[PDB]
């Protein structure tokens, strides 16, 4: 009975309260297998649309970073009521690439009972940090959310990519969890590697007024992962028109030059009848970059003027940092908009200054946090959170994936939290 988030807000709490009014629930997409441990789950992908979901993960054996990749799972399924008015993910279609080490940065979109996942094939490693030697290859997988008993190519299909339109950018790659559909058009979040020498930037355009420790070129050398990097990363969308022809063009739409930061994991989601774009803050500006989409093509995003939600960085770029300094660091903590009247959004954000830890589900306004709830302990390390809100039996429910590496586990996996936006504000 899970549907998309539409209509007016009815029977919730949208005022600031200090009481523990939020009750998260530990849901899971599958039952854990007994007597199994010693593997680490990395690069998670959770995308939600019209009661359907997709998940993707790289399960490795041993070290979380450079162990042996046990499997890569890209699976779609239905989001159903689990029995006690709580939504849990139910996987139906599962696919495993034959080379899990070459698949990076998948990006998942629903359109008409299929789920299109666009990933990057790379025999050179991660296409962000050694992008100069990257081929530029991508892959599109069609997974049926309803798999028939004998469908063949309907259940799992590999759509061949032949026509790539990218313009001035040297290469493009899908760089985010979830995109949108507009009729028959898929808009994945993506990034474009431009060369640094042709990057047109006015060095007097970026704001350096309030901070006395910032040279006014730092806004341009912070646009890549290194100050001397060959490529800059410009975020945006990748457009796939499914009625374009036999081989559709995959067209890169660059983001608007307003509030320009580095290309980071972004996500465009259709909330309350309109697209909302969230670009992660992997740069000097650590306040949350998300806002309304004025035009999908070309990508113009009316960013929120948010002052209370930020991200935990590292040294030299902490939380709540606003001065332009050279840094490529940060975490993906997305926010899903649940009320367009006051622009109230809900998402899991980490609540430490220099450390990626303490995941808190926060429902917040533009310049005020309404109410928060701790998902784990204060010193529990969390890395990347993906929140998607929806309507189950006319109740607003937000399913959140958190990269919780809590102490005492013999197996490492993201935790799935179903958090109802509470009916009564007391």
């Amino acid at each position, epitope marked *: 009975g899970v549907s998309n988030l539409v209509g007016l807000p*009815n029977n919730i709490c949208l005022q600031k309260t200090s009481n523990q009014i939020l009750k998260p629930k530990l849901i899971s997409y599958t039952l854990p297998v007994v007597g199994q441990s010693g593997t680490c789950i990395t690069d998670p992908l959770l995308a939600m649309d019209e009661g359907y979901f997709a998940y993707s993960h790289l399960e490795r054996i041993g070290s979380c970073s450079r162990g042996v990749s046990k499997q890569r799972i890209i699976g779609v399924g239905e989001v159903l009521d689990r029995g006690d008015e709580v939504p849990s993910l139910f996987m139906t279609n599962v696919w495993t690439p034959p080379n899990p080490n070459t698949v990076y940065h998948c990006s998942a979109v629903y359109n008409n009972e299929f789920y299109y996942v666009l990933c990057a094939v790379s025999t050179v490693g991660d296409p962000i940090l050694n992008s100069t030697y990257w081929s530029g290859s991508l892959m599109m997988t069609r997974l049926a959310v309803k798999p028939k008993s004998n469908g063949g190519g309907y259940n799992q299909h590999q759509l061949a990519l032949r026509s790539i339109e990218k313009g001035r950018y040297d290469k493009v790659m899908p760089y985010g969890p979830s995109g949108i559909k507009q009729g028959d058009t898929l808009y994945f979040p993506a990034v474009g590697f431009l060369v640094r020498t042709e990057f047109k930037y006015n060095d007097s355009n970026c704001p350096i007024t309030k901070c006395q420790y910032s040279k006014p070129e730092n806004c341009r050398l912070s646009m890549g992962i290194r100050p001397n990097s060959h490529y800059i990363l410009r975020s945006g969308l990748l457009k796939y028109n499914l009625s374009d022809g036999e081989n559709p063009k995959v067209v890169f739409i660059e983001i608007s030059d307003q509030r320009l930061s580095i290309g980071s994991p972004s996500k465009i989601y259709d909330s309350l009848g309109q697209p909302v774009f969230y670009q992660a803050s992997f740069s000097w500006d650590t306040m949350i970059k998300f806002g309304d989409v004025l035009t999908v093509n070309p990508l113009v995003v009316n960013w929120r003027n948010n002052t209370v939600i930020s991200r935990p960085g590292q040294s030299q770029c902490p939380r709540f940092n606003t001065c332009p300094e050279i840094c490529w660091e940060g975490v993906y903590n997305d926010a899903f908009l649940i009320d367009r009247i006051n622009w109230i959004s809900a998402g899991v954000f980490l609540d430490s200054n220099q450390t990626a830890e303490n995941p808190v589900f926060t429902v917040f306004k533009d310049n005020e946090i309404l109410y928060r709830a701790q998902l784990a302990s204060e010193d529990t390390n969390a890395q990347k959170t993906i929140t998607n809100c929806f309507l189950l039996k006319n109740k607003i429910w937000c399913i959140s994936l958190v990269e919780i590496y809590d102490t005492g586990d013999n197996v490492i996996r993201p935790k799935l939290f179903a958090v109802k936006i509470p009916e009564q504000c007391t």
Partner: antibody
């Protein structure tokens, strides 16, 4: 105490324009929207429309879209309603309400200010 | 818009009795209608939010029920302070409409 106070009863000639005020006290004014509702004497209530003072976002009824405009200011924590070219069928009382539990449940109601449009 | 029809238009209740007032909708409203009470020369006051929930400052006799199209407001052990006009207002479609009215 959340108290909404309506500007005192008007006496308007037909064809003119009328502006009514409603002052909100006892709470943070820019956190809840304020609705305006019509009631004819001896008839049912008609919801005219709401204004959000946090972003000045207004939404009207279809019957009252070209008839009324709703403004607000947080300097005086007050909402305003302006009606123009009133037909004599506008002799009615008007209520300013506070939307609570989201914004469409009218718990706190104003005193209700009545206008009479006659010559 | 959705038309809220209140039935019956007028009612006669001896105090101490239990009375049910019906509110019907043209379309299907999920759970979003609210019951208000208004006395003579008084602003309306809220009784029931979202067709089942009771607010503070209200006696527990005013009970809401129903979902979809037909909704009911039930009052038990009624006294002379319950006489007046009663309204149902929906809040899911954009043009919020009140009912015709019940005595």
């Amino acid at each position: 105490e959340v108290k909404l106070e309506e500007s005192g009863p008007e006496l308007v000639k037909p064809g003119a324009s009328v502006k009514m005020s409603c002052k909100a006290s006892g709470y943070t004014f820019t956190n809840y929207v304020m609705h305006w509702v019509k009631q004819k004497p001896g008839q049912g209530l008609e919801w005219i429309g709401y204004v959000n003072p946090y972003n000045d976002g207004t939404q009207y009824n279809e019957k009252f879209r070209d008839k009324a405009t709703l403004t607000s200011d947080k300097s005086s924590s007050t909402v305003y309603m302006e009606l123009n070219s009133l037909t004599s069928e506008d002799s009615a009382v008007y209520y300013c309400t506070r939307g609570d539990y989201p914004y469409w449940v009218f718990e706190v109601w104003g005193a209700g200010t009545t206008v009479t449009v006659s010559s | 818009e959705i038309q809220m029809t209140q039935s019956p238009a007028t009612l006669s209740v001896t105090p101490g009795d239990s009375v049910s007032l019906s509110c019907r909708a043209s379309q299907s409203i999920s759970n979003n209608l609210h019951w208000y009470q208004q006395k003579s020369h008084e602003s309306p006051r809220l009784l029931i939010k979202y067709a089942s929930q009771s607010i503070s400052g209200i006696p527990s006799r005013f009970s809401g029920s129903g979902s979809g199209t037909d909704f009911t407001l039930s009052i038990n052990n009624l006294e002379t302070e319950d006489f007046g006009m009663y309204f149902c207002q929906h809040s899911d479609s954009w043009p919020f409409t009140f009912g015709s009215g019940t005595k």
